[PDB]
């Protein structure tokens, strides 16, 4: 089905049945359109150049901003992806807090001039898993999707776009896909597809880079997330606690290089650590405290719109995380308009992949339950609990593979529970790369980079076997992962 071992059966599956809609982009937006369109009867296909969420949808600060109602919808439909937590906004010269109280919330805050603060609740999500769960739900309802399929050229007929040309980045082959409507939800790449349609006119895009560093909690012991100012600068910064770590706020610099390879520079790092130390003088945050980091590209219109060409291509310059749903409904409104569909948007009711029927409230009982069910399979109750939180109701699936592969796992010298996450990833999360698993299905590259160092050998060895990789594939797929691991910590690591 949605496995990375059936790609050929999935390529010739959408290049056979004529598609009503084909969307370019596996971002939160592409997945968003894919799901909505699919749940209205518009048979949709989706093509993602690299990995689902591999673009900017995996490089945000991961905050679902509150819009208030929309933030709920998201939470209730997938409580394991988003979780509300407290945010602490210090004050210098909802709950209104004075100085002593503020210091009591975060006893690490700068004392000098602290007048107080306000603490409120904010929903923290998993941009990559969110993107994915929308994808999995879309596919589950009839949508066909493929990562590592790159649209390199458009197909026209009587002046109109009727299909794309996609190159399978994993096998290097090319294919043709036809669709009644073609949406371009390519994020910061939108204009490239607009050039391949020769319609990049008027309002074009200008890119802006932002970076996040990640230090270990022991070295930045935040009680709850804090939203603070900067010394000189003029901007604000987000220090967020997660999985025993604290990833610190964002930078803002112009960007016009390669849209697929932005990363942390020495300026970026020295800028985040600087401010962080300004706000928390107790810490002596140096370049050796950062154990990981990431860069992302944010597009801005020059001279949340939607573009229409003379060929009929629909581009989504918007690209919203917090507002992805209405954004999708709006986009599908246009598609449905064109293909003429008398079907209402009811996506705010659709639970996402792994979402509980009971919605948020029902999740505690859910973990207590899944924790006990996993234990009866001879697994650590706390371990499965954490996996339940990760995978949502889909834990059963990972608990099945994990169960079934106790022998395989031993032979491959890796914990059964980890082997379960892999088979699920390959067979039901369309994982075809080690990078897919370590950075997007688990987020380990960012939040537990030592874990990927520990298991990169054993994992590559297994995948090599699971996919019948050649020497070139095994070696390449190993350099790809090794490369990112290097860029994650070292800003001087030179490529090529
Ligand atoms: C520093 C920073 C901080 C941020 N903070 C927040 C925040 O606090 N809250 C918030 O809500 N959002 C935040 N965001 C970002 C916002 O969430 C995203 O911009 C928005 O969700 C992105 O929609 P994206 O889905 O357009 O589609 P994208 O994710 O940009 O689509 C990416 C995909 O398009 C694919 N693609 C490109 N070209 C082709 C092609 N020719 N063929 C096939 N596939 C192709 C790429 O391979 C890639 O996988 C932040 C961003 C940055 C950079």
Total count of residues recorded for the chain = 496
What is the 475 CA–ligand 1 centroid distance (Å)? Answer: 29
Residue 375 C-beta-side C-alpha neighbours within 13 Å: 11
8 A C-beta contact, residue 321 and residue 60: yes
Name the β-bridge partners of 45.
Answer: 22, 144
What is the 104 CA–ligand 1 centroid distance (Å)? Answer: 37
What is the 319 CA–ligand 1 centroid distance (Å)? Answer: 7
User: What are the angstrom distances between the C-alpha of 462 and each of 21, 100, 399, 478?
Assistant: 36, 54, 19, 12
Whose Cα sits closest to atom 9 in ligand 1?
63
What is the 60 CA–ligand 1 centroid distance (Å)? Answer: 8
**Token pair of 419 as six digits:** 């082997």
* Residues in the chain that come right before a backbone break, where C and next N are over 2.5 Å apart: 66, 93, 303
Whose Cα sits closest to atom 14 in ligand 1?
60
Which position has the token pair 């529970």? Answer: 417
Distance CA 232, CA 234 (A): 6
Nearest to 68 by CA among 362, 288, 250, 323: 323
Which position has the token pair 């739900």? Answer: 137
**Measured in Å, how far apart are the chain's first and last C-alpha atoms?**
36
Give the number of the atom of ligand 1 that is nearest the alpha carbon of residue 298. 53
What is the 297 CA–ligand 1 centroid distance (Å)? Answer: 7
Which residue segments constitute the domains of the chain, with CATH numbers given? Answer: 2-85+122-206+303-360 (3.50.50.60), 86-121+207-301 (3.30.9.10), 361-496 (1.10.8.870)
Whose Cα sits closest to atom 16 in ligand 1?
321
Whose Cα sits closest to atom 53 in ligand 1?
296
Q: Report strand pairing: 174-184 vs 204-216.
A: unpaired
Whose Cα sits closest to atom 45 in ligand 1?
49
What is the 358 CA–ligand 1 centroid distance (Å)? Answer: 30
Whose Cα sits closest to atom 12 in ligand 1?
321
Distance CA 115, CA 102 (A): 9
Name the β-bridge partners of 489.
Answer: none
The residue to mutate among 82, 189, 315, having the most atoms of ligand 1 within 8 angstroms of its beta carbon, is: 189
**Token pair of 155 as six digits:** 């197909």
- Say yes or no: CB of residue 47 within 6 Å of ligand 1: yes
Nearest to 71 by CA among 146, 122, 138: 122
**Entry resolution in angstroms?**
2.7
3-state secondary structure the chain: CCCCCCHHHHHHHHCCCCEEEEEECCCHHHHHHHHHHHCCCCCEEEEECCCCCCCHHHCCCCEECCCHHHHHHHHHHCCCCCEEEEEEEEECCCEEECHHHHHHHCCCCCCCCCCEEEEEEEEECCHHHHHHHHHHHHHHCCCEEEECEEEEEEEEECCEEEEEEEEECCCCCEEEEEEEEEEECCHHHHHHHHHCCCCCCCCEEEEEEEEEEEEEHHHCCCCCEEEECCCCCCCCEEEEEECCEEEECCCCEEECCCCCCCCCCHHHHHHHHHHHHHHCCCCCCCCCCEEEEEEEEEEEEECCCEEECCCCCEEECCCCCCCHHHHHHHHHHHHHHHHCCCCCCCCCCCCCCCCCCCCCCCHHHHHHHHHHHHHCCCCCHHHHHHHHHHHHHHHHHHHHHHHHCHHHHHHCCCCHHHHHHHHHHHHHCCCCCHHHHHHHHCCHHHHCHHHHHHHHHHHHHHHHHHCCCCHHHHHHHHHHHHHHHHHHHCCCCCCC
What is the 377 CA–ligand 1 centroid distance (Å)? Answer: 39
8 A C-beta contact, residue 413 and residue 211: no
Distance CA 203, CA 130 (A): 30
Q: Report strand pairing: 174-184 vs 19-24.
A: parallel
Output the CA torsion sign for 379, 380, 383, 385: positive
**Token pair of 30 as six digits:** 């592409």
**Token pair of 377 as six digits:** 């399979």
Expt. technique: X-ray
- Say yes or no: CB of residue 49 within 6 Å of ligand 1: yes
Nearest to 43 by CA among 315, 332, 317: 332
- Say yes or no: CB of residue 29 within 6 Å of ligand 1: yes
The residue to mutate among 70, 74, 186, 249, having the most atoms of ligand 1 within 8 angstroms of its beta carbon, is: 186
8 A C-beta contact, residue 145 and residue 138: yes
- Say yes or no: CB of residue 373 within 6 Å of ligand 1: no
**Token pair of 204 as six digits:** 């074009």
8 A C-beta contact, residue 135 and residue 31: yes
- Say yes or no: CB of residue 387 within 6 Å of ligand 1: no
User: What are the angstrom distances between the C-alpha of 56 and each of 131, 244, 262, 320, 321?
Assistant: 11, 24, 10, 11, 10
- Say yes or no: CB of residue 371 within 6 Å of ligand 1: no
């Amino acid at each position: 089905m949605f496995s990375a071992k059936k790609r050929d059966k999935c390529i010739g599956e959408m290049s056979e049945k004529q598609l009503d809609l084909l969307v370019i982009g596996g971002g939160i937006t592409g997945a968003g359109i894919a799901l909505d369109a699919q749940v209205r009867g518009i048979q949709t296909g989706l093509v993602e150049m690299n990995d689902f969420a591999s673009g900017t949808s995996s490089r945000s600060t991961k905050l679902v901003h509150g819009v208030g109602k929309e933030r709920a919808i998201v939470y209730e439909n997938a409580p394991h992806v988003t979780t509300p937590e407290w945010m602490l906004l210090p004050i210098f010269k909802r709950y209104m807090l004075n100085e002593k109280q503020t210091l009591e919330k975060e006893p690490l805050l700068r004392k000098e001039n602290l007048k107080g603060g306000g603490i409120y609740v904010e929903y923290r999500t998993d941009d990559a898993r969110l993107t994915l769960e929308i994808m999995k739900e879309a596919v589950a309802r009839g949508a066909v999707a493929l990562n590592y399929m790159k649209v390199e050229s458009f197909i026209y007929d009587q002046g109109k776009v009727v299909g794309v040309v996609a190159k399978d980045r994993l096998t290097d082959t090319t294919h043709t896909i036809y669709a009644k409507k073609v949406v371009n939800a390519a994020g910061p790449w939108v204009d490239t597809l607009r050039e391949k349609d020769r319609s990049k006119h008027g309002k074009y895009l200008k890119l802006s880079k932002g970076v996040h560093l990640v230090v270990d909690q022991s070295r930045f012991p935040l009680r709850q997330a804090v939203y603070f100012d900067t010394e000189s600068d003029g901007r604000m910064i987000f220090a967020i606690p997660r999985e025993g770590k604290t990833y610190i706020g964002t930078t803002d610099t112009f960007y016009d290089k390669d849209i697929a390879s932005p990363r942390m520079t020495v300026e970026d790092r020295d800028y985040i650590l600087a401010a962080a130390n300004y706000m928390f003088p107790s810490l002596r945050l140096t370049a050796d405290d950062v154990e990981s980091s990431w860069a992302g590209l944010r597009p801005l219109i020059h001279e949340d719109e939607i573009f229409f060409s003379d060929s009929g291509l629909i581009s989504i310059a918007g690209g919203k995380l917090t507002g992805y749903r209405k954004m999708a409904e709006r986009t599908v409104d246009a598609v449905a308009q064109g293909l003429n569909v008398n079907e209402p948007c009811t996506t705010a009711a659709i639970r996402l992949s792994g979402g509980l029927a009971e919605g948020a409230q029902g999740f505690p009982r859910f973990l207590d339950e899944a924790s006990r069910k996993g234990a009866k399979l001879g697994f650590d109750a706390d371990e499965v609990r954490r996996l339940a939180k990760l995978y949502g109701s889909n834990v059963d699936h990972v608990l099945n593979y994990a169960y079934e592969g106790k022998e395989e796992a031993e032979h491959y010298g890796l914990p059964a529970l980890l082997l379960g996450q892999l088979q699920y990833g390959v067979e039901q999360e369309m994982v075809a790369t080690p990078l897919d698993f370590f950075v997007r299905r688990t987020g380990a590259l960012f939040f537990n980079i030592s874990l990927v160092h520990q298991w990169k050998e054993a994992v590559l060895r297994w995948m090599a076997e699971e996919f019948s990789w050649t020497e070139e594939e095994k070696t390449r797929f190993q350099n790809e992962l090794e490369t990112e691991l290097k860029m994650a910590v070292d800003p001087l690591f030179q490529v090529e």
